[PDB]
Design a protein around this ligand. Structure first.
Ligand SMILES: N[C@@H](Cc1ccc(C2(C(F)(F)F)NN2)cc1)C(=O)O
Length: 306
């Protein structure tokens, strides 16, 4: 079912009724924004996969290369950000996304865009702006005014003109709660789960070096997964299990030595989850399988990038 495939592997949809209205329409578009990133990782990929779901469901897809956002979030200088953006677009194309790419700066410095920023800046408390940004804002001992401008730009109605659906990570939900209240026309939010970093420590992220990047070499993927936090029995906050859930194809045929049970054919992730949880599946065999299926999943993307 179409709704159910869009919903597969999301954390929430605001709201599912509105989404149902959206899907009946002949024409619908879904946006996502990304601060240009030095490395594109499985956190990026999960979300582009969701956009590919939407595209399969007939949506026109818009990718905002959120360059001014990144500028405000201290990712550096704008033309240098825009060249990272340009690379991100190649990466996204190599994932098989069919989309229109927009650079934020091409319209975000327009007079109407800027007046909406100041209009919204009158309606938005500093306390709320700062709360919305707690998971987004670059680490800063002395937070900058830039921090609170960022979420009000993110809620600006000009980003969403003729857009039915916005997709983002659950780390975006407080900014989206703001836009829910303050956008003149409602946009459905589709929020994706945040992937745990390989060390189990916090979330996967470009600046935390705890990610597998989609163009990692096979041995690099192998070594990254070997090291990964993956306690026997434990599923919650286990990033190897997360990768099995969000990226793998089922049925999944786990190769093992007969000394360790021999080949294991798992028909669903929930099946994999119980086998791992009661312990018929060791970390090391999950890892080899995850690493090997992840390598196969990534390799056309690495190939195109190389
Ligand atoms: N805050 C996001 C980046 C981001 C920038 C801009 C938007 C958006 C967009 F329209 F959805 F793209 N409203 N502008 C949505 C997300 C991040 O953390 O990368």
């Amino acid at each position: 079912d179409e709704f159910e495939m869009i919903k597969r592997n999301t954390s929430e949809i605001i709201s599912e009724e509105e989404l149902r209205e959206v899907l009946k329409k002949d024409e619908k578009s879904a946006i996502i924004g990304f601060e240009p990133s030095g490395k594109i990782h499985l956190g990026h990929y999960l979300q582009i996969k969701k956009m590919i779901d939407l595209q399969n469901a007939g949506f026109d897809i818009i990718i905002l290369l959120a360059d001014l956002f990144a500028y405000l979030n201290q990712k550096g200088e704008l033309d240098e950000i825009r060249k990272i953006g340009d690379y991100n677009k190649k990466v996204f194309e190599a994932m098989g996304l069919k989309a229109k790419y927009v650079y934020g700066s091409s319209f975000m410095l327009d007079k109407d865009y800027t007046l909406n920023v100041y209009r919204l800046a009158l309606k938005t408390t500093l306390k709320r702006a700062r709360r919305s940004m707690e998971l987004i804002a670059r680490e800063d001992e002395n937070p900058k005014v830039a921090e609170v401008i960022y979420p009000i730009m993110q809620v600006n109605p000009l980003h969403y003109e003729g857009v039915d659906v916005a997709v983002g990570g659950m780390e975006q939900r407080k900014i989206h709660m703001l836009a829910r209240e303050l956008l003149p026309k409602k946009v459905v939010c589709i929020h994706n789960p945040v992937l745990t970093g390989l060390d189990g420590e916090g979330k996967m992220s470009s600046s935390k070096g705890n990610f597998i990047a989609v163009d990692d070499s096979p041995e690099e993927i192998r070594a990254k997964i070997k090291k990964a936090y993956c306690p026997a029995g434990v599923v919650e906050g286990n990033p190897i299990m997360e990768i099995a859930k969000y990226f793998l194809e089922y049925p999944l045929t786990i190769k093992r030595p007969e000394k360790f049970g021999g080949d294991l054919t798992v028909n669903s992730y929930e099946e994999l989850e119980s086998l791992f949880k009661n312990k018929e599946l060791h970390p090391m065999d999950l890892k080899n399988a995850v690493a090997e299926e992840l390598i196969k999943i990534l390799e056309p993307i690495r190939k195109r990038l190389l």
